[PDB]
Design a protein around this nucleic acid. Structure first.
Ligand SMILES: [Mg+2]
Ligand SMILES: [Mg+2]
Ligand SMILES: [Mg+2]
Ligand SMILES: [Mg+2]
Ligand SMILES: [Mg+2]
Ligand SMILES: [Mg+2]
Ligand SMILES: [Mg+2]
Ligand SMILES: [Mg+2]
Ligand SMILES: [Mg+2]
Ligand SMILES: [Mg+2]
Ligand SMILES: [Mg+2]
Ligand SMILES: [Mg+2]
Ligand SMILES: [Mg+2]
Ligand SMILES: [Mg+2]
Ligand SMILES: [Mg+2]
Ligand SMILES: [Mg+2]
Ligand SMILES: [Mg+2]
Ligand SMILES: [Mg+2]
Ligand SMILES: [Mg+2]
Ligand SMILES: [Mg+2]
Ligand SMILES: [Mg+2]
Ligand SMILES: [Mg+2]
Ligand SMILES: [Mg+2]
Ligand SMILES: [Mg+2]
Ligand SMILES: [Mg+2]
Ligand SMILES: [Mg+2]
Ligand SMILES: [Mg+2]
Ligand SMILES: [Mg+2]
Ligand SMILES: [Mg+2]
Lengths: 50, 77
RNA sequence: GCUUGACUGCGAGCGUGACGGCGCGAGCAGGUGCGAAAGCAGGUCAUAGUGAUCCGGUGGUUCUGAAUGGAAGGGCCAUC
RNA sequence: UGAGCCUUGAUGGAAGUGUGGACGCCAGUCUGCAUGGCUUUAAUGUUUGAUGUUCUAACGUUGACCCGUAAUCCGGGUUGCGGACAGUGUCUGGUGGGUAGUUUGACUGGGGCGGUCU
RNA sequence: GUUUAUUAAAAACACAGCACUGUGCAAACACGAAAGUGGACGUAUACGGUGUGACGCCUGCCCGGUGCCGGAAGGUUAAUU
RNA sequence: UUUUGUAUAAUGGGUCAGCGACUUAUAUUCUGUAGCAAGGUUAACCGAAUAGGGGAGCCGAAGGGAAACCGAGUCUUAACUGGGCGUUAAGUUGCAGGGUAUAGACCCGAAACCCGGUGAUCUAGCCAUGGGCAGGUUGAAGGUUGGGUAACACUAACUGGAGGACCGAACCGACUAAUGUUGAAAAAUUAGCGGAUGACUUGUGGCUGGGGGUGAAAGGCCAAUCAAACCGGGAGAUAGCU
RNA sequence: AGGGUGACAGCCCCGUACACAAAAAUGCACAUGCUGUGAGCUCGAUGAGUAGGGCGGGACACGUGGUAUCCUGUCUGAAUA
RNA sequence: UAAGGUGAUAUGAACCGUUAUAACCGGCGAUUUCCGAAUGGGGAAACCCAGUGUGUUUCGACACACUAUCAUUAACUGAAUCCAUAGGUUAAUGAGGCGAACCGGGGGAACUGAAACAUCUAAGUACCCCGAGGAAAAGAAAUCAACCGAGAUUCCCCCAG
């Protein structure tokens, strides 16, 4: 579970970076509350051309 | 039933096998948990009965394409 | 006293067992020991001192080696 | 707080007023403290665990309320409590006559007991 | 009072009483792969289990063994790594 | 029949008639017989269907060695003067047959184990709802009223009507004996016997199911069945026994 | 062929050999109408919680054996002509 | 198709037919009570009772049609909560039950054999459950081979006890 960010976010926050988080933190908080999206290789250029 | 809605995993039969190699019928059943997913795509919460892995699939494939199957396949949800 | 014949490969032919097997054996081949030498020595005066097969261990072995070279595993010999 | 590497530790403007440590068999009157033309000793960044705190946002709720609904099921919703504990899956050590399948020799002046078995 | 319907009615079983013990409630426990249900629409003056067996006077010594309760130190010790 | 041995007082048969136990398939070897012979023969299949084709294959004319390998020899050992096994004797395919193997394998026969169903119209316990207990005794608590005390306590009459209380029918039970034992009856009859306002008794319906129920506990009971019900199935379980 | 007929029938009867038969309704071939479906060429594309692994089992004649190969309940996890 | 018929035990009565509507045989229609998947609710199978519609020169009450459940689809309605989903209604389609074996799959014995018995055997058999067809299944190589080659699946005889 890698994912790319939206708003800031704690000890990784950077508005469109490739951070690596624990699956739980992801699919329970980060995603559900609109703060990130998985590195499904589609999305890796939506927030990588910034 | 103890069936994972996304992978279709259900209990299988096997043996136990003691040191003396005695066979005893048993079951390996899947790791269900029934987890509340956030879809956003429907501004709703979906509780699925899910195997771990099932969860790892939803993480990979993405809920939306998973829920695309199921409906395509028949499941309520 | 000196020694390693309590040697290795074989064995005419006998004994004794339902069988598995056990036992006695001159002699031949190689190499060894004692003796001046003829000779004696294949454990102990003899008859108890023992445990089949399977499974596997150790060493040796060009015997085998699942496409080929290998290797694993197997076989054969010694032994546990 | 356990452990490598990068490192915050040193590897093959001179001389002055000069005063705590050093594992140093059994204490170097030397340096600053203001000043003068890619390591044993540990700790900052970590990737990685152990423990403890607190959090909520998974998970539990056999508290309350709301709707489906004139319904003590169920579901959803809000909240309260609980909380990464519990519980469950796989794996695993213990326990396990609760349950289950079986074994528990022969000879023999009947059988058992004794004795015997090469 | 109960019991071997169909050879045993008793001294056997039950019993009120007594004691140990488990049990804080989603109780222990039991039926059940589960949901659930009984326990109880009860809550430690309750409920389960065990033994004893009205009542009277009483109920001594032993914790080595086995079991149960408690034991953060050490030795042995699983999957894993 | 079984036995060392049976007139045996050891087994079996009342009698007759009818049925009633070494089979079948496929493998394999031997003997007989037949065809062909250092050769014999095909299988599935084709099929003009018992023919004809089909030689895939199998057996044999070469063995020795674990084997590589060598080959009328080979193995053994550095090597045999040797020793082991071979060389010298016909084979193969049908057909009938004597054995064997796999099969229920001569026939009948268990007690049992597993699987799926059927049973709480008997009986055990529970649930809900209805019913029954002639007649006769004893006289608890309480009350009232007199005596009694400072008042209580106490006491006497009376009233009152408790109880797995008392006697005894219905009703529920089953302690003794006789009868019965091819019964009137697969547990009864007769005369005695226990309880009879209770943990009593009773009608109807409901619920619990087989290693399971239920059990005031006897291993009792769950349809004349119970140390694991009945019915069907694995099933021709297995039977060194008769 | 066979059956029957007052006992055994080629020539008594029903048949048998042989030869014909469908107004309807249908099984099956082709052929078309209708309905839906796509054919053709060019340039593309090439099956990931998968393969592989650890733990447990199970399938393969093959009993974990030195045991390849297949399946997966569990925890993981690639390359990509 | 016909000279004879009104099925049978089974006579008789009363009849029908003989040149094409007697009867007999075949195709397609018709009617087809009640129960049974049973389907309007209920129920001790062959019975009990409803809703809404129709229906009567005797337009009462009774008779007849429809009214199960689930699925897909459509329309309209429509909570906590505004949207929205849930829910609710209706409409059209489809399923349901049954059946000898063969077939695929989910589950899966024990006797027994081993001369006892646990590994092993019986055996993925017996049985239970789901499902399908006229057959099912399997099938167009991430297959074999052995440096020569072969070319999906299926069945048969060999290979070979
Ligand atoms: Mg036992
Ligand atoms: Mg047994
Ligand atoms: Mg004996
Ligand atoms: Mg009494
Ligand atoms: Mg009795
Ligand atoms: Mg007693
Ligand atoms: Mg107590
Ligand atoms: Mg005798
Ligand atoms: Mg005799
Ligand atoms: Mg005589
Ligand atoms: Mg006698
Ligand atoms: Mg006699
Ligand atoms: Mg022929
Ligand atoms: Mg009853
Ligand atoms: Mg009875
Ligand atoms: Mg009384
Ligand atoms: Mg009395
Ligand atoms: Mg009695
Ligand atoms: Mg008397
Ligand atoms: Mg009497
Ligand atoms: Mg007893
Ligand atoms: Mg038998
Ligand atoms: Mg059998
Ligand atoms: Mg491909
Ligand atoms: Mg009806
Ligand atoms: Mg109905
Ligand atoms: Mg046996
Ligand atoms: Mg297919
Ligand atoms: Mg090629």
């Amino acid at each position: 579970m890698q994912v790319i960010l939206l708003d800031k976010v704690a000890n990784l926050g950077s508005l469109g970076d490739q951070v690596n988080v624990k699956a739980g933190y992801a699919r329970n908080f980060l995603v559900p509350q609109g703060k990130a999206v998985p590195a499904t290789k589609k999305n890796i250029e939506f927030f990588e051309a910034r | 039933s103890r069936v994972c809605q996304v992978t279709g995993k259900r209990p299988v039969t096997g043996n136990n096998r003691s040191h003396a190699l005695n066979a005893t019928k048993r079951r390996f059943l899947p790791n269900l948990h029934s987890h509340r997913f956030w879809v956003e795509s429907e501004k709703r919460f979906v509780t699925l009965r899910v195997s771990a892995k099932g969860m790892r699939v939803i993480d990979k494939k993405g809920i939306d394409t998973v829920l695309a199957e199921l409906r395509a396949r028949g499941e309520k949800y």
